[PDB]
Amino acid sequence: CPLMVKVLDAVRGSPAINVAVHVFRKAADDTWEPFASGKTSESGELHGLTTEEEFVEGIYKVEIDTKSYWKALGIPPFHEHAEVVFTANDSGPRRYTIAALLSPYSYSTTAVVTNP
Amino acid sequence: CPLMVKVLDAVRGSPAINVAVHVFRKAADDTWEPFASGKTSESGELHGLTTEEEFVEGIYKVEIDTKSYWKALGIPPFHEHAEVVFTANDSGPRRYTIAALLSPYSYSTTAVVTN
Amino acid sequence: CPLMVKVLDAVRGSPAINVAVHVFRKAADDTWEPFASGKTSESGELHGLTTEEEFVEGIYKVEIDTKSYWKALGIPPFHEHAEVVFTANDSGPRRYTIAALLSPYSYSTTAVVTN
Amino acid sequence: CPLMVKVLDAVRGSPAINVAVHVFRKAADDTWEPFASGKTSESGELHGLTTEEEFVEGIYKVEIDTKSYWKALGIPPFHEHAEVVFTANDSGPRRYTIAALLSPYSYSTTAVVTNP
Ligand SMILES: [Cl-]
Ligand SMILES: [Cl-]
Ligand code: NA
Ligand code: NA
């Protein structure tokens, strides 16, 4: 599991469940190519997006579909989605956790990068 | 002037208006002594808490009354208040902006310190 | 005026100065068209990106060039940039402040929307 | 495990390790009485602070010793500590996770309250 996504809801104080997440990898022509996707679980987590073999160095984008999440709760949101863009680097063994904390008009995102 | 408080509401995307703020300063006996208080304006800001003369070196606590703010909006919040504790003016006078971004079950606080 | 960007540095407790910001607007063909750009001032603010006349309804993307900011300060950052995507002016004209609070491996963004 | 504390470092993108955490419970005389304490682990977590039996309804304070953490890293910080104050409420079964994300001049705290 080299890449995991965790989403929290700051209004309810809970995991953000059933949030759609789309991952893209930047192609040689500078376009975003679909890479992996899923929906967060009851724990607000999305595991098994990729493998160590496929997750090579590159520029990746994680799109978290926040607007659909808030609309389902009946809360008017600001953003279309949250976008997290970063370079994956082979500086020794690494695991990446992309965390996001959501509010209707604000979000925060943190990366937790560890040596397993 | 040397100490300002700014509060935003992350649910509405607006300044957090009429939020009560209490400032304390740690005394020689280690107790929290009342220092200043007020309420945020329509812009979510609270100015005029103190003066350069009165705002001496010390340990200060800025208590932002978040629970009362959320309850008045009909939203159940988690925290009793947000507490911001810091040493001020230990390298000479500075201007401090204590900013807070509020959600019902989360908040962030940042300090902007200028010379 | 109707669109302002404000950026703070959570490591230094200061405005984030000289941060490049690029704004795009989604076109009818679903592509991101350049809309405006600039750099934050000594106050961490970027004013004058657009006018009420030009800032019509649409989907906008505000790209804040965080990696270049951190690299210039000698700090290794995680993100390439912070991207803020939103629909603007769909219920008539509004004034938008896009605020961002930066750390090397984390950022937050908030919108303050006024009528 | 009704109460857990998790601390992250936003400068390094890592768990905040060996951070001292002190929990207090508000007494009848309005004073803060020591309740539990510990240091965050290699995962930035602090488990086993209390038990379901002892963790009754009340007002609690979680103090995270951020200044000592940053001083050890040689980074000048703003806050003396981060303080998280809340009422524990018996609205059915509950687990509380107090999360904190630390930067030298800013921190964020979130509560994740779940029904186990
Ligand atoms: Cl003042
Ligand atoms: Cl503008
Ligand atoms: Na994975
Ligand atoms: Na516990």
Numbering used by the authors:
A (entry chain A), D (entry chain A): 10 to 125
B (entry chain B), C (entry chain B): 10 to 124
Question: Which statements did the authors publish about this structure?
Answer:
Transthyretin (TTR)3 is a 55-kDa protein that aggregates into amyloid fibrils under pathological conditions. Amyloid aggregation of TTR occurs by dissociation of tetrameric TTR into monomers; these partially unfold into amyloidogenic intermediates and self-associate into soluble oligomers and amyloid aggregates. Here we identify two segments of TTR that drive protein aggregation by self-association and formation of steric zipper spines of amyloid fibrils.
To pinpoint which of the eight segments drives aggregation within full-length TTR, we created individual proline substitutions within each segment. We chose the substitution to proline because it is known to inhibit fibril formation. As additional evidence, we tested fibrillization of the segments 91AEVVFT96 and 119TAVVTN124 in isolation as well as their mutated versions to find that the substitution of residue 85, 92, 94, 119, or 121 did hinder self-association and fibril formation.
